[PDB]
Design a protein around this ligand. Structure first.
Ligand SMILES: O=C1N[C@H]2[C@H](CS[C@H]2CCCCCc2cn(Cc3ccc(C(=O)O)cc3)nn2)N1
Length: 322
């Protein structure tokens, strides 16, 4: 009802202690009977709440659904994000973020259980099924020149990779510049956009799509051989909250590095984490396509490639297939 999020927030805020119905009733100023109705509704939606007479209620486990009340606890304690917008469905978190940043200097992120019109690089369709992935857009306000956009994309890749790697038994690798893999399966795609002028950056908008709990049968039949999810590499059930918590952790860690470190300081770390070496890569450049081999990521984030004809390229960004 009107108070599901408020009750949920109290149940979460009180872990691991039980909270009595009277206590919830007095803090939301609603009847004992209303409180039980809300608790019954939360359990209906998949919340695991233990209820004990004379003692109260204890949130044990949330379902595979984003709840604004819970996410409000994360932003409350965050030293980076002012707020967040949580939706069950939306056309795109990226479209929503680009609209919400206008006219302010807030830092925030937008979460949606499903996207109706998810878009990747080059306006590609991004599947954003309900209940199976993290579809998030992040808006930050770095006081840096606009050329720094490429460096942000490099620092954030290691952040996303680190959070995923924490939950995966198999190695998680970055595919420069915008994709993350677990073995041969893509588990994440991200992209960094900006609003800027000559005097600097007005906002960074980072759209992050992560496959959390798909089963192989849930991926398309065509892409199934090169698509994976975190759950497919975690012996334990994957918890959306637990993952989001570490993902926000790492984004903040890598965002402070971005502001304080040159790319030289993470470059070596970035190479050990990339899966683009010692292999034929296929490059797309508008109309042209060609094969080549990645030689190095230089000190400035540029990939150095020796193409099939022996010629060299130095690319700030590329469209790479395996
Ligand atoms: O609209 C929104 N965008 C963002 C936020 C939440 S998601 C987030 C999505 C951004 C994706 C950026 C990375 C990317 C990769 N590619 C090529 C590609 C993509 C999928 C497959 C596949 O078969 O899986 C294969 C190749 N394009 N773009 N909201």
């Amino acid at each position: 009802s009107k108070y599901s999020q408020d009750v949920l927030q109290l149940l979460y805020k009180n872990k691991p202690n039980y909270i009595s119905g009277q206590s919830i009733a007095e803090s939301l100023n609603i009847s004992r009977t209303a409180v039980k109705k809300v608790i019954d509704q939360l359990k209906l939606e998949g919340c695991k709440i233990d209820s004990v007479n004379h003692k109260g209620h204890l949130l044990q486990q949330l379902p595979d659904i984003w709840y604004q009340g819970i996410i409000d606890q994360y932003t409350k304690s965050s030293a980076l994000f002012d707020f967040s917008e949580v939706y069950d469905s939306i056309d795109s978190t990226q479209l929503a973020a680009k609209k919400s940043l206008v006219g302010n200097q807030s830092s925030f992120f937008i979460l949606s259980d499903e996207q109706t019109k998810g878009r990747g690089r080059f306006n590609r369709h991004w599947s954003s099924s309900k209940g199976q992935g993290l579809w998030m857009s992040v808006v930050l306000r770095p006081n840096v020149a606009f050329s720094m956009i490429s460096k942000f994309n490099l620092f954030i890749a290691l952040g996303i990779r680190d959070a995923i790697q924490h939950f995966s038994q198999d190695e998680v690798k970055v595919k420069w510049p915008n994709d993350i893999y677990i073995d041969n399966g893509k588990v994440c795609g991200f992209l960094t956009e900006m609003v800027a002028n000559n005097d600097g950056i007005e906002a960074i908008i980072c759209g992050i799509g992560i496959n959390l709990t798909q089963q192989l049968e849930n991926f398309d039949e065509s892409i199934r051989h090169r698509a994976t999810s975190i759950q497919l590499h975690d012996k334990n059930k994957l918890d959306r909250y637990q993952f989001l918590e570490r993902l926000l952790q790492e984004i903040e860690k890598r965002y402070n590095q971005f502001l304080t470190l040159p790319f030289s300081e993470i470059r070596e770390e970035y190479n050990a984490a990339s899966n683009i070496w010692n292999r034929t890569l296929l490059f797309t450049e508008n109309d042209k396509q060609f094969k080549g081999q990645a030689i190095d990521l230089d000190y400035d984030g540029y990939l150095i490639v020796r193409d099939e004809a022996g010629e060299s390229h130095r690319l700030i960004s590329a469209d790479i297939d395996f």
